[PDB]
């Protein structure tokens, strides 16, 4: 969350997609069980990089590259490795009750609410600021910093 535009549709606005790719991928996730945010590329339509830059855009947030952006260690310890791995997310900047969460899919509310609960156990009452990254880059970020 926030609710977001469809990923495929923001890719259309960005010149990165046709609405045809959006709806076809959407029909795929309706049967596949994954998200539009996954099927735009799993359906073989839109570039995963495009998807990655675009999901935070879909929410009004920036593209943040995991191999660049500093994974402030408090953040991966704030939100546990298993929990991060589980949603395809990786924690970054902290402030007050805030956490920047670098996600392959910023729309993924499972992270944000299970993250919320983890953050609260640590002492932050949530206020996540989703940001988006290439899944592989956060995979490597997840592998490297807990």
């Amino acid at each position: 969350l926030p609710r977001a535009k469809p990923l495929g549709e923001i890719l259309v606005e960005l010149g990165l997609a046709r609405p045809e790719d959006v709806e076809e991928a959407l029909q795929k996730q309706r049967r596949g069980g994954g998200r539009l945010e996954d099927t735009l590329v799993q359906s073989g339509k839109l570039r995963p990089e495009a998807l990655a830059q675009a999901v935070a855009t879909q929410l009004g947030y920036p593209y943040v590259d995991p191999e660049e952006d500093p994974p402030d260690p408090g953040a991966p310890l704030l939100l546990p490795e298993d929990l991060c791995r589980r949603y395809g997310v990786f924690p970054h900047r902290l402030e007050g009750n805030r956490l920047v969460l670098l996600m392959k899919d910023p729309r993924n509310i499972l992270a944000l609410d299970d993250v919320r609960l983890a953050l609260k156990r640590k002492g932050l009452n949530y206020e996540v600021a989703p940001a988006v990254a290439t899944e592989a880059a956060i995979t490597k970020l997840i592998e490297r910093f807990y």
Binding site: E49, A50, Q53, D65, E67, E68, D69, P70
Partner: protein
């Protein structure tokens, strides 16, 4: 010194026209100037450059001076024109490294700033440097 192929992320991450790279690469190859500052304006946005250099050199892209706050430890001695022209300020410390914000980490005259202490280098746009000129000193 190794990097992750300056110019390639720019194309691969959708940051540039290939033209920025090829013209710039040729100038690096033929004039000896450095690909980083050569690339911008060749079909490459300044933001786009710095994000590629950031990743490619193991460095970090910087946002405006709301983010790039100068460090008075040097900034009050530093002329405002040094903050602008190297596009650089030495900042704080981490581990033993002191941050060097730069207009271009490939541009070693600017990476030189700070290096009395180890450093990670950081990157930003001409306007970041003009605003830093305006605020730092």
């Amino acid at each position: 010194q190794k990097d992750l192929k300056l110019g390639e992320l720019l194309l691969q991450k959708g940051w540039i026209s290939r033209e920025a790279l090829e013209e710039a690469l040729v100038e690096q190859e033929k004039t000896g100037d450095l690909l980083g500052r050569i690339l911008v304006r060749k079909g490459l946005p300044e933001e786009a450059l710095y994000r590629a250099l950031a990743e490619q050199k193991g460095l970090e892209f910087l946002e405006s001076t709301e983010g790039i706050v100068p460090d008075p430890s040097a900034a009050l001695l530093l002329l405002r024109s040094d903050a602008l022209r190297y596009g650089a300020v030495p900042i704080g410390f981490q581990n033993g490294e002191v941050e060097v914000v730069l207009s271009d980490p490939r541009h070693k005259e600017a990476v030189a700033q700070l290096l009395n202490r180890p450093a990670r280098f950081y990157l930003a746009l001409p306007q970041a440097w003009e605003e830093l000129f305006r605020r730092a000193y």
